[PDB]
Write a protein that binds this ligand. Sequence first.
Ligand SMILES: [Zn+2]
Ligand SMILES: [Zn+2]
Lengths: 105, 107
Amino acid sequence: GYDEEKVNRIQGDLQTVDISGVSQILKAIADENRAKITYALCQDEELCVCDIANILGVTIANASHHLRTLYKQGVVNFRLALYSLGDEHIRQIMMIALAHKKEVK
Amino acid sequence: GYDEEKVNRIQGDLQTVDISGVSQILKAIADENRAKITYALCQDEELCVCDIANILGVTIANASHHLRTLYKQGVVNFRKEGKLALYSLGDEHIRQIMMIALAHKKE
Ligand SMILES: [Zn+2]
Ligand SMILES: [Zn+2]
């Protein structure tokens, strides 16, 4: 084969982490509208579903659907239901991707 | 309307930020194979396309195609040497995104 020891070791490294779960969580945030929601909750502490539907310019059903999806991945929490960021890890991923996207070259 | 002032303001904050671009880069990393490439590049400074293909268990052509995508979205960089093309994480932002995403999912 080719570089089998290094390759087998990195496959091992991948097998020991939930790369699948990373893909799910990033996919949830990556949706245009869910990314807007996530950014919106980085700025205001809590929003209700109607605020979110109006901000996004989408139906209340669509916003509910988007919040359900974020909720399943811990991206948002709820406490009328008011939504907030799941935790500080979500805030940091947002701010880091935004910083990275401003770089030149 | 409903909460027009708050909605207006937040729409205003959102307009100042490149959310479209954030979506593009997160989508690039989220793909199941491209997430594995990204994590794999957290384990060595540089890997060649052949290592990446063998780690994923994909063809060298399919590996190339993921790497092109990652490259275009600024997730990976590369240099040529031998010649042989060597790919690395863009910078620490990508490592942080990967590691923070992993941390969140296990909590
Ligand atoms: Zn960066
Ligand atoms: Zn977390």
